[PDB]
Amino acid sequence: LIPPSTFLPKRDKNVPYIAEVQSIPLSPSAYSVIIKDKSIFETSLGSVSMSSFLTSIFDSAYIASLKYKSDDNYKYIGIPLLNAFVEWQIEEIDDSLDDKSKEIIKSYLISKLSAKYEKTKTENAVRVRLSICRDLYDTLSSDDLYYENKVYSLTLRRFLKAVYEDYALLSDCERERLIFADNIIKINEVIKQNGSRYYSFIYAYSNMYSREKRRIRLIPYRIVSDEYKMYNYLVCLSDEKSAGKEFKADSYRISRLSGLSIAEKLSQKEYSSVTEYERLKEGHVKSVKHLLSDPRFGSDESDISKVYLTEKGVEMFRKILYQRPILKGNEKPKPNTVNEFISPPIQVKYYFNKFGKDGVILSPSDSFEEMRTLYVEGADAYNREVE
Amino acid sequence: IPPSTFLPKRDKNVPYIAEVQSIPLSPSAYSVIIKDKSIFETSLSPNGSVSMSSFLTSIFDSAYIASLKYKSDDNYKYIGIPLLNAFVEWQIEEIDDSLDDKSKEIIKSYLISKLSAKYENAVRVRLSICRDLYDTLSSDDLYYENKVYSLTLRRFLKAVYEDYALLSDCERERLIFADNIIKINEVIKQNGSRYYSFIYAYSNMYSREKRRIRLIPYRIVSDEYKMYNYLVCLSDEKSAGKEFKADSYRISRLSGLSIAEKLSQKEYSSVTEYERLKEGHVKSVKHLLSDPRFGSDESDISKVYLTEKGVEMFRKILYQRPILKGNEKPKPNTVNEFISPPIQVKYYFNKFGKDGVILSPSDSFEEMRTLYVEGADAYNREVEM
């Protein structure tokens, strides 16, 4: 006769909280994506419990939805907006519409999201046991999930299944931004404070260029994905490469930063190394621009690699775009000749390692010697299976 | 007046010349489409090819007809064909028919305006427009697409192929094999609950050469990996023509699908009692609906020997990394079974050398052996004075 409003009832805060367990039935495919992401995250950061990992995903996705039209939504730039969260999808409705039109659109959205996450699937579901911590309990019992309560008809099981099934469908780089949301939020705060003036740096811990964590100074510029949606990078100025002495453009995997500090202002000597007339110097701008377009390999150095391409090699070069290196002045490669690549030698090697005789890396000597070893030992392995 | 359609109506009295449209695709979309094309081609006769234009045209034709026919009398034909966000007609027709006209017009305007805003270092893909695609792109049957993409063909086609590339493997496979799916759906509708009729089909499923079998379709389902779609059916293959038994066929390994013929009364009485599927067939079919692949699909497993170093490289190199059997962790210094397409295993382990040796299938082994043996000879030759 009178329905509850929230997924879970408000708890007596006077009584100690005891964590209740919710069983979430996940598709084998969603479970296996979450297992993979969890053991990859752990290598950053041991062990994290499945509950903690599922809670991080929920917390990140939720705060981006809740704060979508917030005054401080600059904090959540790049945090994915999951289809399972509904607040953002209501707030996205054209603000210029009359109230009656918005109510009709709101009902159209609630009904279509209900139908989508209410479709019974034929599957062998994996029972995933989420322990609900006090902070998650208070979120799931709050009034701040109004539209989710309506879409999922007050059924926590349905809501959480939808969150984790949607998580599992995101690209690698999207899933990574949910997992490392806390790094992204602190970076977004500093980018806003700094604008174009780059008054301030943050301290951060990096194992990007070291086995042990180094405390370095970063001047953030922009977070980007590679073009294949694999990894997120902070393009920035860093003092790592000169070991504290001066700031140079670089690109850090967001997964290899931790323990980010509040922004502190640079000293006038240091501010004058970075900026002139309160703008990033031409040299920093140029280097940053190179890293925005290639945030994996832009960070390495422009040395010559000599590669002999056959006719077949040029045809393979034309068809295989993944991490494909460039010639001088972005020329087309020439068949049956030595071609000069100016991309970092490591990227040339990662491209032509699958070409064998159709893409023979002649130099530098390093690349020649690694390819010769890979191929001679590989050949011996394949021949061993025949004889 | 001013243009109404993506392309103007052509004078049909003039011989047709295919004009080429340059479509700027994200590197990620292009890489998904060239992989799909290579994998589709492995369904054809040994050395067989499709042009990029033909492959992109098939994707467009499948996605389009599912959108156009979403509410039609014969929409039974398109059950399971993905409805791309790039196509708009279905999204207008999906509006709850029970709403008053004013509410529907408000939702229609909300959808047109929001889809306009959403689809407003590319790989330039040169799509040759065949006569039938030209006549579609110049028809009035893209009313809402013309509004959403402001009459700009480049924008519409980019949206189609970017959305294609975002689908799961099994969704993309259902657009590519739509013609098989449509013929299967026709027979599912005709049969309903009575299963009166079978179709003949050719299977690459359980033979090296195409085998002519009889199928009673039940339902198309995806495996637990969202990799391949299976027709769950009854089939006469296992008893070699003698009787119908529950089975599962990759829709990618069915071809030459015939008209439905009615079963003979001896055969109909093996399959049904009182015009309903016998409990035994129901029970076997139910196991295959929840897992259509496990312990029926043995066909194109890749055997790869990984060293300790191989396992470390497997852990670190995620790009197009193939799926193990049951999604197990790979094991060092032993043969590992990969259930990803043989092409994807080969594109992953071609850079592993002795740390990732593809032992089977025979084709993969012989290509890798040739790549490595001829590669070694090329690198060794450069050390000779």
DSSP string, B245-310: EEEEEEGGGEES----EEPPHHHHHHHEETTEE-HHHHHHHHHHHH-SSTTT--TTPEEEEE-HHH
Element (H, E) at B71: none
Judge if B200 and B131 occupy the same domain. Answer: no
**What is the C-alpha separation between B103 and B91, in angstroms, rounded?**
15
Of B113, B138, B167, which marks where a domain is finished?
B167
Distances (CA, A) of A195 to A189, A278, A286: 10, 11, 18
CB < 8 Å from A in window 254-283 of B: none
Query: For residue A31, is it within any domain?
Result: yes
Q: Which technique was used to obtain these atomic coordinates?
A: X-ray
Which structural domain range is residue B353 located in? 297-381
- Mutation target for B interface from A41, A354, A371, A386: give the one with most B CBs within 10 A: A354
Provide DSSP, B35-67.
HHHHHHHTTSSTT----HHHHHHHHHHHHHHHH
- Mutation target for B interface from A382, A384, A385, A387: give the one with most B CBs within 10 A: A382
CB contact under 8 A, A371 and B359: no
* CB-nearest partner of B353 from A227, A229, A375: A375
Q: Which of B188, B191, B346, B175 is nearest to B251 (CA)?
A: B175
Interface check for B52 against chain A (CB to CB < 8 A): the answer is no
Amino acid at the residue A134 = R
Provide DSSP, A120-134.
------EEEEEE--H
Query: For residue A2, is it within any domain?
Result: no
Judge if A99 and A193 occupy the same domain. Answer: no
Judge if A144 and A175 occupy the same domain. Answer: no
- Chain B nearest CA to A108, separation (Å): 7
Interface check for B94 against chain A (CB to CB < 8 A): the answer is yes
Q: Which residue of chain B comes nearest to A318, CA vs CA?
A: B123
- Chain A nearest CA to B20, separation (Å): 19
Interface check for B76 against chain A (CB to CB < 8 A): the answer is no
**What is the C-alpha separation between B106 and A200, in angstroms, rounded?**
48
Of A109, A142, A170, which marks where a domain is finished?
A170
Query: How many domains are contained in chain B?
Result: 3
CB < 8 Å from A in window 5-44 of B: 26-28, 30-31, 34
Judge if B22 and B154 occupy the same domain. Answer: yes
Judge if A161 and A177 occupy the same domain. Answer: no
CB contact under 8 A, A386 and B375: no
**Token code pair at residue B167:** 């689908």
Query: For residue B101, is it within any domain?
Result: yes
Query: For residue B212, is it within any domain?
Result: yes
**Are B231 and B296 contacting, i.e. CB atoms less than 8 angstroms apart?**
no
Distances (CA, A) of A325 to A153, A340, A371, A375: 53, 10, 17, 21
Q: Is B186 helix (H, G, I), strand (E, B) or coil?
A: helix
Judge if A185 and A175 occupy the same domain. Answer: yes
| Chain A partners within 8 Å of B123 (Cβ) | 321
User: Which residues are CB-contacts of A291 (< 8 A; sequence separation ≥ 6)?
Assistant: A233, A235, A249, A250, A251, A298, A299
Query: For residue B287, is it within any domain?
Result: yes
- Note the Cα B371 to chain centre separation in Å: 29
Judge if A208 and A226 occupy the same domain. Answer: yes
Q: Which residue of chain B comes nearest to A294, CA vs CA?
A: B121
**What is the C-alpha separation between B339 and B30, in angstroms, rounded?**
24
CB contact under 8 A, B221 and A378: no
**Token code pair at residue B28:** 């990620």
CB contact under 8 A, B110 and A94: yes
* Residue written as token pair 């496990």: B294
CB contact under 8 A, A383 and B375: no
Judge if B123 and B265 occupy the same domain. Answer: no
Q: Which residue of chain A comes nearest to B52, CA vs CA?
A: A319
CB contact under 8 A, A319 and B34: yes
Length of chain B counted residue by residue: 385
**What is the C-alpha separation between B85 and B21, in angstroms, rounded?**
21
CB contact under 8 A, B379 and A372: yes
Query: For residue A1, is it within any domain?
Result: no
Longest dimension (CA), chain A: 82
Query: For residue B1, is it within any domain?
Result: no
Length of chain A counted residue by residue: 387
**Are A342 and A328 contacting, i.e. CB atoms less than 8 angstroms apart?**
yes
Judge if B319 and B374 occupy the same domain. Answer: yes
Measured at the alpha carbon of residue A99, what is the angle toward residues A97 and A104, in degrees to the nearest 5? 85
**Are B118 and B149 contacting, i.e. CB atoms less than 8 angstroms apart?**
no
Interface check for B230 against chain A (CB to CB < 8 A): the answer is no
**What is the C-alpha separation between B377 and B370, in angstroms, rounded?**
10
CB < 8 Å from B in window 310-339 of A: 319, 321-322
Query: For residue B255, is it within any domain?
Result: yes
Distances (CA, A) of B226 to A118, A352, B6, B40, B292: 20, 32, 35, 16, 11
Judge if A124 and A256 occupy the same domain. Answer: no
Of A255, A274, A299, which marks where a domain is finished?
A299
Judge if A181 and A154 occupy the same domain. Answer: no
Judge if A219 and A197 occupy the same domain. Answer: yes
**What is the C-alpha separation between B294 and A205, in angstroms, rounded?**
46
CB contact under 8 A, A230 and B27: no
